Amino acid sequence: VNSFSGYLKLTDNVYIKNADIVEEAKKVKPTVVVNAANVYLKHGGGVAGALNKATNNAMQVESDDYIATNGPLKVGGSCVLSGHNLAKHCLHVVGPNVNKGEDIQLLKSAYENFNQHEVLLAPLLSAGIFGADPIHSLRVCVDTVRTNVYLAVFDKNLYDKLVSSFL
């Protein structure tokens, strides 16, 4: 038994809720929150800017030091950093950005990062401003992630479409 409340169960291991991933993290303080990162860990908007704003920019300060030491992530890759006031840890995962021409096949590689963590609070990778079809992202998530994932879908309209079209 864990502290996640109000989720619809899609599969043995995948759960979904209409919620802002930021308010959910503040309430639950999960072990792992996933950020929809880019390779530069430049958290300007979407999930990353909203998460970073909730940390009062501490996420960006830590991320800049990480990049200065290690260089950019790979598309499909990840790193583990602090969760600040939101979670124990933040798993920064880079899904392909369709609005930059990145191979959508890299979405499965991105979701494979989640398998290194027993339980995660996450957004749909490559959705929102990353330009992928969220229905596709949920299918890849279900078919790739074997650990327990709690998906926060910010848009109520999209949430209802994801549930009602789920196979």
Ligand SMILES: OCc1nc2ccccc2[nH]1
């Ligand atoms: O704080 C406004 C907000 N923008 C968001 C974008 C993506 C996910 C959650 C968000 N919350």
